[PDB]
Amino acid sequence: VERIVSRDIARGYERIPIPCVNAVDSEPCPSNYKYVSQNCVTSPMNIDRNITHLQYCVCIDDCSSSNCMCGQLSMRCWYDKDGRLLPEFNMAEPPLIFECNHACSCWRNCRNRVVQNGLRARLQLYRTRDMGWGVRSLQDIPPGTFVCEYVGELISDSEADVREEDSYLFDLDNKDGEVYCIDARFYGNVSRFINHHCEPNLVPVRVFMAHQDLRFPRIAFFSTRLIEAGEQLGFDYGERFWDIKGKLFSCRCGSPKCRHS
């Protein structure tokens, strides 16, 4: 049966609740980590929160205009009227997305705000037969839908290499300086549990909201196709993950086009 080992792994820190069920074995709700809904630091990082340093729009409209500055910074605004990505959005080379911010003259509900509006999808954490823990959806999710964000603990490239647990890191490659990481091993939200699949229904997009300090993008997962209810969430981890972890185990993603089996 479907044993509800938790009603909300997030303890009410998310807009909708995220339950954990287990219908394959004894393992209880996972608790070897601290759930956080936003990113934190352990070592101080000189993030540029200086308000006068923000690019911002002055739209007298809802930032549908061809004149929205923040849309220009994303090349265009890629959000449709109900905050889904356009079909012309390039899932293969996702652009940088700059959402409107508190410096903009626009209203909190202008069109260029999506990631920042919190989690909007009913998902759930559950036990899988082949990969341990996994995250799956309980509703249909259209394509181009902001599913969730990869939240974790901001650490330097350096500190990244010295940690004995590389199973939860996410590379945040600023080209134009130091490269940073999100380690979601000790602190993290639900995305720490999302598994790798070679035909991924999810794609990470680099997104800027309350600050535009390029060293620290935030990582947003949008759906690449329709996700039917019950479907497990998955995204491509990349080659550097498999160059390394592959030497120790293979990809039980189960796809016919599976590239790491």
Partner: peptide, 5 residues
């Protein structure tokens, strides 16, 4: 070390 991207 193994990084997701």
């Amino acid at each position: 070390t193994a990084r997701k991207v």
